[PDB]
Design a protein around this ligand. Structure first.
Ligand code: RWF
Ligand code: MYR
Ligand code: MYR
Ligand code: MYR
Ligand code: MYR
Ligand code: MYR
Ligand code: MYR
Length: 582
């Protein structure tokens, strides 16, 4: 139209508009105080109301970037607090915004956000609901400069909902706490996937990304024509390139147009897009990106017809390699919603290696005639891992299951830091209780989703303070061999056991007076240290000690003079245990 703000204000709503503007400013001016951002918000909202009333009013013709950039340069302490960034204000708009993007500190040094007591939170919420939500919308956004703004809004509303429901509940904490812990994890996971998708698009390039997308989109929209999926994969590539660059406005419009395109062609893509297409602007694309897989056509041919048997396969492949390979993916992915995306990529990659060496020899048709038998071991490997590990988790519980993984991984990379091992294992455990809950049909996709962030988390840490070549190998390998590389790690035969430290195995009464989470972590910590000291301990020998300890604790956290029990009996435990572990 004639006025951008006016238009955005109208099909967004005053409430949503003010929240997004706050997020946007908090993501650039990460150092300014809350009271300051609220003022800017009010000022931009007022200005916006002016344009809604009269599209010809002053400045209402200016573009969003221009308007956004002029207000940013308004801040007086800009140069004194942000330094270089202030020199951005000296350039012509096109470069000005580009300049601002370059200075968006992805990770500032702000104190960790501490969760206050349920009672102080609930009371604050009742006293002033609005500033309570905005204050935290602000604290989160400033710490996560690249989190796509609208999604952050979606999390804000889920937090408001948890307070509404829980602050009225009889037992506040039993209600609110678990919901908040739930929100945090999903929030941190969403943030990790976002950063990951951008990282991958930079390291491995466009082709790899497009392949991941074709597979993913084909499972989702199995009824769509290949030309339709290619079309969407193309736009999705543009969309994420821009969104990764960090330009919110640019990102938002590309996503909007795409969401618009999909809904208008709704019948030619998926039947399950009905709901999502009914929702308002702000929510369309979010919904679509999360929609359930549609049902695959009941009448689908065998892949071997067009990709193995049919002579002249090499003719179609040489005609246009990636297109053909893309069609392979499309066809294979839409018949297998139960496969993880990387598995599909492994299959596609195997096919490529085959067609490459087979199309350059005597009788092609017979060289690549087998290929589908190449897939079997590839498909079964992740499947066996899934059932083996889920069975085990059903036997032991989440906690005792975490302990098993703990012993297994400490033995494979004893060089890693204990607190790192404890965290990684605990998270591997969660993926276990989250995913083993699903029918075998939705398991592999479930693990892939969660395992991808945990493995990326693991790598980043390790990147900071490297400790094992093996870990570095897997972490720098192709994103398709990442998990398989960690799966292939074997017990470290080299490792020289840590020498005994009396303290490391000394326990007091505090452990009795602690919470579940903290008790476990205390126990789990001693367990990693144990294995590092005697890495040759048998699952049996080890289980023997864990049983004595299990009791030992009990005996002392139920005995009169606890101070000495943990000291007299502790002497015994440690001494005996060492005797049994040689
Ligand atoms: C994590 C996801 O599976 C999101 C999905 C996707 C598919 C292929 C490559 C990357 C991401 C996805 C979107 O990011 C999206 C954004 C705007 C509009 C529609 C969208 O649809 C989608 O399926
Ligand atoms: C999350 C975006 C919306 C802001 C509302 C958050 C309100 C809950 C406050 C708790 C946040 C502290 C994070 C944590 O759980 O450790
Ligand atoms: C438009 C179609 C583009 C898709 C290209 C298909 C390529 C399949 C190869 C598998 C990719 C594995 C990733 C990699 O090795 O880089
Ligand atoms: C200075 C004007 C600030 C305007 C704030 C940006 C507008 C956000 C619109 C996002 C629309 C949702 C699109 C989508 O992701 O599906
Ligand atoms: C499923 C819960 C158990 C936790 C252990 C994860 C086991 C799944 C491993 C398979 C990973 C699928 C991704 C891939 O294809 O490599
Ligand atoms: C904290 C560093 C220790 C590294 C632990 C490796 C993480 C294991 C992830 C691989 C999951 C597949 C399960 C398996 O095959 O073992
Ligand atoms: C040689 C030192 C002997 C002491 C060993 C301490 C035992 C550490 C493992 C504790 C974990 C037990 C598992 C549990 O019951 O939760």
């Amino acid at each position: 139209h004639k006025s951008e703000v006016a238009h955005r204000f109208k099909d967004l709503g005053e409430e949503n508009f003010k929240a997004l503007v706050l997020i946007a400013f908090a993501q650039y001016l990460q150092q300014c105080p809350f009271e300051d951002h609220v003022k800017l918000v009010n000022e931009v909202t007022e200005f916006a109301k002016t344009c809604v009333a009269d599209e010809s009013a002053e400045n209402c013709d200016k573009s969003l970037h221009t308007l956004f950039g002029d207000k940013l340069c308004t801040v007086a302490t800009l140069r004194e607090t942000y330094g270089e960034m202030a020199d951005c204000c000296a350039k012509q708009e096109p470069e000005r915004n580009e300049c601002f993007l370059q200075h968006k500190d992805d990770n500032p040094n702000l104190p960790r956000l501490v969760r206050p007591e349920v009672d102080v939170m609930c009371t604050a919420f009742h006293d002033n609901e609005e500033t309570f939500l905005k204050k935290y919308l602000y604290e989160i956004a400033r710490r996560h400069p690249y989190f796509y703004a609208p999604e952050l809004l979606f999390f804000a509303k889920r937090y408001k909902a948890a307070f509404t429901e829980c602050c009225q509940a009889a037992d506040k904490a039993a209600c609110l706490l678990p919901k908040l812990d739930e929100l945090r994890d999903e929030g941190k996971a969403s943030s990790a996937k976002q950063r990951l998708k951008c990282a991958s698009l930079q390291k491995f390039g466009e082709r790899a990304f497009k392949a991941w997308a074709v597979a993913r989109l084909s499972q989702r929209f199995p009824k769509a024509e290949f030309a339709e999926v290619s079309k969407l994969v193309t736009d999705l590539t543009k969309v994420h390139t821009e969104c990764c660059h960090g330009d919110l406005l640019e990102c938002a419009d590309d996503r909007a147009d795409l969401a618009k395109y999909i809904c208008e062609n709704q019948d030619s893509i998926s039947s399950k897009l009905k709901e999502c297409c009914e929702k308002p602007l702000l929510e369309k694309s979010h919904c679509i990106a999360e929609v359930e897989n549609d049902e695959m056509p009941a009448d689908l041919p065998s892949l071997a017809a067009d990709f193995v048997e049919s002579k002249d396969v090499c003719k179609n492949y040489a005609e246009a390699k990636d297109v053909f390979l893309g069609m392979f993916l499309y066809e294979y992915a839409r018949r297998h919603p139960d496969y993880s995306v990387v598995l599909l990529l492994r299959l596609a990659k195997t096919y490529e290696t085959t067609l490459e060496k087979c199309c350059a020899a005597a009788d092609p048709h017979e060289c690549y005639a087998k290929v589908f038998d190449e897939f079997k071991p590839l498909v079964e490997e992740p499947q066996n891992l899934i059932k083996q590990n889920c069975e085990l988790f059903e036997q032991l519980g989440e906690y005792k299951f975490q302990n098993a993984l703990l012993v297994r991984y400490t033995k494979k990379v004893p060089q890693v830091s204990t607190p790192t091992l404890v965290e990684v294992s605990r998270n591997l455990g969660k993926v276990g209780s989250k995913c083993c809950k699903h029918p075998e049909a939705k398991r592999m996709p479930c693990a892939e989703d969660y395992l991808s962030v945990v493995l990326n988390q693991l790598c980043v840490l390790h990147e900071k303070t490297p400790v094992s070549d093996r870990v570095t190998k897997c972490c720098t390998e192709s994103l398709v061999n990442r998990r398989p590389c960690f799966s292939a790690l074997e017990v470290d035969e080299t490792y020289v056991p840590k020498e005994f430290n009396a303290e490391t195995f000394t326990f007091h009464a505090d452990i009795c007076t602690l919470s579940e989470k903290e008790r476990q972590i205390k126990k789990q910590t001693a367990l990693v240290e144990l294995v590092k000291h005697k890495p040759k301990a048998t699952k049996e020998q080890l289980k023997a000690v864990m049983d004595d300890f299990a009791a030992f604790v009990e005996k002392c956290c139920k005995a009169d003079d606890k101070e000495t029990c943990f000291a007299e009996e502790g002497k015994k435990l440690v001494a005996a245990s060492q005797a049994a572990l040689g």
